[PDB]
Structures are given as C-alpha cells and as structure tokens.
C-alpha cells in the first residue's frame, strides 16, 4: 500500500522487544519500505488460503501474543535481506530486489514452515513440537534461502540435488544466525523446537548423527521417503560445511578450519556460478573446490581445507 514509512515496536515469539519498519496509511501495516521493493507480512488467520491480509495494526505497537509471530517474521526477513545485501552484494532473493512476502498463523497447529514458490509461510506449531516457527532466525533464513536457491542453481528438490538444496538452506540459515549474533550455534531450529525440552534441536550441523542423520557418504539414505532423503542426507553436506569453517578430525581425517566468512563466500560462489538443477554431491565438491580456487588460488589453505572436509565425509 501507499503511505508513510515509520517505525513501530513489538515483542517477538521469545518475548524480546524489537523495532520494526511499518507503513502508515489510516492503519499501521507490516510493510517495510527500506529494503528493496519491500518486505510485506500477512495474516493468514488460521486458514490455508494465501497470502491472507496485509498485517494491519491500529497503534503501531505489537505486543499482543497474536502479534508475535508476525513481528519476528517481518524483522528476521529484514535481517536476512541485510545479510545477503551486505555480505554477498545480492539484492533480495532474485538479485533484482523482489518484494519479500511472508504469511504467519498459517493453518492450525501447523508444525512447518515453507517457501511455496512465491512467498514464505509459517505455522504456529502445536505448542509441543514447535512454537511459532518465525521465532527462529535460522528458520526464517533457511526459508528465504530456498528462494535464493530457486533463482540461482535451481537444485531439484529430490535425491542428492535436493539434499544439497536443503544443506544450502541450513548453512546460510546458520550464517545469518551468526550475522545477527543472536545466540549463534551450529544447530538448526533450537529456538522454536520442543519448548518443553532444553538443549535440543531439529538438526545439528556439528554432529548430524546426534539426531540420526548421516555424517558420512557411506551412511546415506537410499530409500524413497522424504523425496529420497533430502532432510536426511543433507547431514553429510552440513557436516562438511561445519568442518570447513570450524576444523576438526572426522573419521580419522583432519581438517584445518578457515572460518565462517570464507565458508559463506565459497558456498555462495558455488551456488551462484557452478551448481545446476541436477548437481550431485560429487559435483558440489568440484564446484566448492573451483570456487575456493577462484577466490584464494589453487595452492591455498582454503582449497586444501575444502578438499579435506569432503574427504572426511566420504565425498569424492
Ligand atoms: O520441505 C519443505 O520445503 C519445507 C521444509 N520446512 C520445514 O522443515 O519447516 C521446519 C523447519 C524449517 C527450517 C529449519 C527448522 C525447521 C523445509 O523448508 O525444508
Ligand atoms: Ca497494536
Ligand atoms: Ca541459536
Ligand atoms: Ca541455530
Ligand atoms: Ca527444545
Ligand atoms: Zn528446507
């Protein structure tokens, strides 16, 4: 809508206070005009019809518990935009500042979030498995990264290409979590998963097997569930990414870490220059080695660490 840019205040899912960019026109709307063609947040009103109605508020204060998931979806989309812009010189998910849209309060007791090809969508969770999913910055960033992937490599959501697609979203979700410096870790979804249980998460990048995901290519899932295990075999790549950044010894193979910033640069280049819709794990390795070579030279420590990491998880 057309109106005046202003700034409101609210409380997120975890009870933290934050400022959010809104637009004034009779009502205050969750519309951020400061980033690209805008960030727009919608109320799906417990239904499944999308996008719902652009979020309207009477006083520019968002402290109702109903408001919380909207606050976080709106705010964290903003942070994710900033990350891609400031760190990788990318303007929104399409590279041309496309408007970013999210709907919250999707369905009832819905334990999921997704990119539907056009926008992000967040359930409120059932209160046991999940609380509202936009409360996790690694969740929001994971979802927006699916959009980035769809506009660049276009990795098919199936088998090995799909697992790469998933890992890319976990990797960048995590890098965005570190960027915002919000209790960063190498775990996925910890802030919104099982509110009754401390210290757990949905997935782990540092140790995927902790939650039954493979940390080695020999342990990959070869069945048909989960589109050929896209959320399972991603563990293999997640572990490789963890090793490149942090270093360590895995199945007897030692890796010197090169840190988060270089990890991000290598994988962003691979994603945007070398991966294709049908890339498999072995092609990912090649893309990553070539990217590091491009950036740091073929005899660099960087190239060496990328090679050691993929060796450690058994990807040749
Ligand atoms: O399969 C899909 O496309 C939807 C799936 N969504 C999903 O797993 O929602 C929960 C969640 C998301 C990110 C991080 C932690 C938890 C996905 O995005 O991978
Ligand atoms: Ca209000
Ligand atoms: Ca965290
Ligand atoms: Ca995390
Ligand atoms: Ca928990
Ligand atoms: Zn995903």
Curated annotation (Swiss-Prot):
Cofactors (names): Ca(2+); Zn(2+)
Q: Looking at the keywords, is Repeat present? A: no
The free-text temperature note is:
Thermostable. Retains about 45% of its activity after treatment of 90 degrees Celsius for 30 minutes.
Q: Which GO terms describe its molecular function?
A: metal ion binding; metalloendopeptidase activity
Q: Where is the active site?
A: 143, 231 (proton donor)
Where along the chain is Ca(2+) 3 bound? 177, 183, 185, 190
Identification of the protein by name? Thermolysin
According to its UniProt entry, this protein's organism is Geobacillus stearothermophilus (Bacillus stearothermophilus)
Full protein: residues contained: 236 to 551 of 551
């Amino acid at each position: 809508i057309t109106g005046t840019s202003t700034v409101g205040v609210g409380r997120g899912v975890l009870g933290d206070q934050k400022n959010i960019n809104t637009t004034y026109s009779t009502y205050y709307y969750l519309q951020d005009n400061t980033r690209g063609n805008g960030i727009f947040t919608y109320d799906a009103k417990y239904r499944t019809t999308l996008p719902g109605s652009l979020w309207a508020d009477a006083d520019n204060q968002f402290f109702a518990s109903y408001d919380a998931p909207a606050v976080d979806a709106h705010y964290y989309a903003g942070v994710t935009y900033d990350y891609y812009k400031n760190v990788h010189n990318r303007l929104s998910y399409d590279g041309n500042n496309a408007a970013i849209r999210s709907s919250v309060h999707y369905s009832q007791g819905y334990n999921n979030a997704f990119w539907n090809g056009s926008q992000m969508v967040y359930g409120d969770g059932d209160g046991q498995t999940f609380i509202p999913l936009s409360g996790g910055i690694d969740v929001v960033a994971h979802e927006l990264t699916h959009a980035v992937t769809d506009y660049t490599a276009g990795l098919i959501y199936q088998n090995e290409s799909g697992a790469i697609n998933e890992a890319i979203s976990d990797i960048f979700g995590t890098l965005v979590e570190f960027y915002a410096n919000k209790n960063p870790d190498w775990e996925i979804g910890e802030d919104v998963y099982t509110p009754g249980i401390s210290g757990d998460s949905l997935r782990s990048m540092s140790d995927p097997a902790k939650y039954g995901d493979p940390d080695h290519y020999s342990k990959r899932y070869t069945g048909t569930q989960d589109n050929g295990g896209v959320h399972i075999n991603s563990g293999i790549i997640n572990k490789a990414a963890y090793l490149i950044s942090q270093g360590g010894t895995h199945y007897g193979v030692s890796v010197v870490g090169i840190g988060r910033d270089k990890l991000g640069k290598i994988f962003y280049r691979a994603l945007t220059q070398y991966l294709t819709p049908t890339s498999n794990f072995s092609q990912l390795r090649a893309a990553a080695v070539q990217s590091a070579t491009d950036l740091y030279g073929s005899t660099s420590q960087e190239v060496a660490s990328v090679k050691q990491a993929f060796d450690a998880v058994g990807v040749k």
